[PDB]
Write a protein that binds this ligand. Structure first.
Ligand SMILES: NOC[C@H]1O[C@@H](n2cnc3c(N)ncnc32)[C@H](O)[C@@H]1O
Length: 338
């Protein structure tokens, strides 16, 4: 087998001329020439079989991406693995080669307002389809938004995704660990398991703010710091919004804080389009029940140059174990590519 940066990368002979792109916790990413389609592709090596959590996330990613078909969601073109479960140690996911991701782009590039608008449109168009499938992405952030050289945007990494379950969303204070810290909605720390679609809208609002300034809006230094940053900008929640939190530990924590004033969005983002800031405010609303939903966000005036509900498709078929069963499930889910 071919080897890249000291790693077995067993993809031949369809895929040749490999180039290292980036790493993961149990996964290297390379580009490769697809000798059948005569184009360069991205290939992700995944080695999850030693750990049941890894197998969980791998199965979620594969199952969701194989069922979704949308212009703003990365597709799986091919899956490479050994012909038998016994010989299967790694799985390789082949995808369209994307030039960059929004994380890397924001490190060095200022976005025009036209780019911000277009990127946001595409994020929300993809999210409309995800949510229409009753799925929550649950880890939206700039590094999970891939971009090609013409700025087509595709959402990736569904390894943390779940089927929405709003009836079983409530939990206690300071227990929950959903999404990546900077993109985590305030209720995750207060009373929510992150099983409602509003969790993803919050993340999108954080991404929009980061597109406006190239810095994360709520850069909590650790898990407990995150709510400090959110409330330092949004200000103290209203009585009505506190009354919506029945859990006493969560409500009394908020009541224990000194009063904080809202920081106006236009003071934080003095160069931003006022329509963008109006939409930002609606996505970064403290109360998740008052928070804008994805179809309302698409219809917001900021996006009027792009909005077209007939061209914002929804999913046809919404979604309604020891590592050994999970390996067998991954083997079965990848069979169609043999
Ligand atoms: N993904 O995490 C490790 C590295 O792989 C990159 N990547 C993941 N999928 C990719 C894809 N389809 N096309 C191009 N690059 C990709 C990601 O941008 C990061 O730099």
């Amino acid at each position: 087998p071919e080897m890249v940066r000291g790693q077995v990368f067993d993809v031949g002979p369809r895929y040749t001329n490999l180039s290292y792109i980036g790493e993961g916790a149990y996964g290297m990413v390379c580009s490769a020439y697809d000798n059948l389609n005569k184009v360069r592709v991205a290939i992700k090596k995944i080695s999850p079989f030693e750990h049941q959590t890894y197998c969980q996330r791998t199965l979620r990613e594969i199952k969701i991406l194989l069922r979704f078909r949308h212009e703003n969601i990365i597709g799986i073109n091919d899956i490479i693995r050994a012909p038998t479960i016994e010989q299967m140690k790694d799985v390789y996911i082949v995808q369209d080669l994307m030039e960059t991701d929004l994380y890397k782009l924001l490190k060095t590039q200022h976005l025009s307002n036209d780019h911000i608008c277009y990127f946001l449109y595409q994020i929300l168009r993809g999210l409309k389809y995800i949510h229409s499938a009753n799925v929550l992405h649950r880890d939206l952030k700039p590094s999970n938004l891939l971009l090609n050289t013409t700025c087509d945007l595709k959402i990736c990494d569904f390894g943390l995704a779940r089927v929405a379950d709003p009836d079983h969303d409530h939990t206690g204070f300071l227990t929950e660990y959903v999404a990546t810290r900077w993109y985590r909605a305030p209720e995750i720390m207060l009373n929510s398991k992150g099983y409602t679609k509003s969790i993803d809208i919050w993340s999108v609002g954080c991404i929009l703010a980061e597109m406006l300034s190239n810095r994360p809006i709520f850069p909590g230094k650790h898990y407990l710091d995150q709510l400090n940053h959110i409330l330092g900008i949004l200000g103290s929640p209203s009585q009505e919004d506190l009354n919506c939190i029945i859990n006493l530990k969560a409500r009394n924590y908020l009541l224990s804080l000194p009063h904080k004033n809202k920081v106006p969005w236009n003071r934080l983002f003095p160069n931003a389009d006022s329509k963008a800031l109006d939409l930002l405010d609606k996505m970064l609303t403290f109360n998740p029940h008052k928070r804008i939903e994805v179809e309302q966000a698409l219809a917001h005036p900021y996006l009027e140059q792009y909005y077209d509900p007939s061209d914002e498709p929804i999913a046809e078929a919404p979604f309604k174990l020891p590592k050994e069963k999970l390996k067998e499930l991954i083997f079965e889910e990848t069979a169609r590519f043999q």
